[PDB]
Design a protein around this ligand. Structure first.
Ligand SMILES: NCC[C@H]1CN=C(O)c2cc(-c3cccc(OC(F)(F)F)c3)c(-c3ccccc3)n21
Length: 270
């Protein structure tokens, strides 16, 4: 069936994502392969079929909402699974985008960061915790100026209780995980968005080493507004309880008067 519905193009960019076309309507797709031997967390669909957690998570967050990458279909194979993902065209990941432009202007960082917050909120609303929010896991739909979360491969069902496992990016991980190998989903997510926002306005992440993470001292290597500095420092509070909630972030003075995605595209992307 797969090869009957999708024309496979070349590799894109340890992960295995190929360019693809849906032969039905020539819709651009991405084809992610995951080998069963490499899967740590297994979920179960309503039908009680054993699938990778990523399928569960993508199925739970897959609706009208443009802020998360839509899982169009998936397949079981003897030794692997194959996820069909939407592919914007043209498209750039936020890592390559920040690398090319360096530090983003606050206005564009605000629009991008707002869109990421809206997307993370949607995930949380649908019982999904991403656990690997970072520039690489954000695609820019360059025409529409819309960001899309990708890679729920380290994700989990959202729970209000302690997490004692983590398979995400260390330099984006919060001090409580480094020190005590324990975190709560939302507060840890606010940490990673702190790192992300720092990365957007400074053109690089703030911390390389465990000691730097644990100390949580933030040096700005670029001119960044006082209000943006405050929001970053707040997201990056050492004590989880001291971190802002999603509501508190989106009500922060820095987050006000956000550009519409189309506005953002017109001004900053073309
Ligand atoms: N480091 C990022 C993580 C890699 C590995 N895990 C994943 O779950 C993943 C999914 C995709 C992806 C999703 C939708 C469209 C898509 O196509 C597009 F890039 F837009 F052309 C790719 C990529 C990926 C992104 C960008 C470049 C290469 C792969 N990834």
């Amino acid at each position: 069936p797969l090869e009957s519905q999708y024309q496979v193009g070349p590799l894109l960019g340890f992960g295995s994502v190929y360019s693809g076309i849906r032969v039905s309507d020539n819709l651009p797709v991405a084809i992610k392969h995951v080998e069963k031997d490499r899967i740590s967390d297994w979920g179960e669909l309503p039908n009680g079929t054993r699938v990778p957690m990523e399928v569960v998570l993508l199925k739970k967050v897959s609706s009208g909402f443009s802020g998360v990458i839509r899982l169009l279909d998936w397949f079981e194979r003897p030794d692997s699974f194959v996820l069909i993902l939407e592919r914007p065209e043209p498209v750039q990941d936020l890592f390559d985008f920040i690398t090319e432009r360096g530090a983003l202007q606050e206005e564009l960082a605000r629009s991008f960061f707002w869109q990421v917050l809206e997307a993370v909120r949607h995930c949380h609303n649908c019982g999904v915790l991403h656990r690997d929010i970072k520039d690489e896991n954000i695609l820019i739909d360059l025409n529409r100026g819309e960001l899309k979360l990708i890679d729920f491969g380290s994700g989990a069902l959202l729970k209000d209780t302690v997490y004692t496992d983590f398979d995400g990016t260390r330099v984006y991980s919060p001090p409580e995980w480094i020190r005590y190998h324990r975190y709560h989903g939302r507060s840890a997510a606010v940490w990673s968005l702190g790192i992300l926002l720092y990365d957007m306005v400074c053109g690089d992440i703030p911390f390389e080493h465990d000691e730097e993470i644990i100390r949580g001292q933030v040096f700005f290597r670029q001119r960044v507004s006082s209000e943006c500095q405050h929001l970053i420092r707040w997201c990056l509070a050492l004590r989880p309880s001291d971190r802002p909630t999603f509501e508190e972030i989106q009500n922060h003075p820095w987050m006000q008067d956000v550009l519409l995605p189309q506005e953002t595209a017109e001004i900053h992307l073309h």
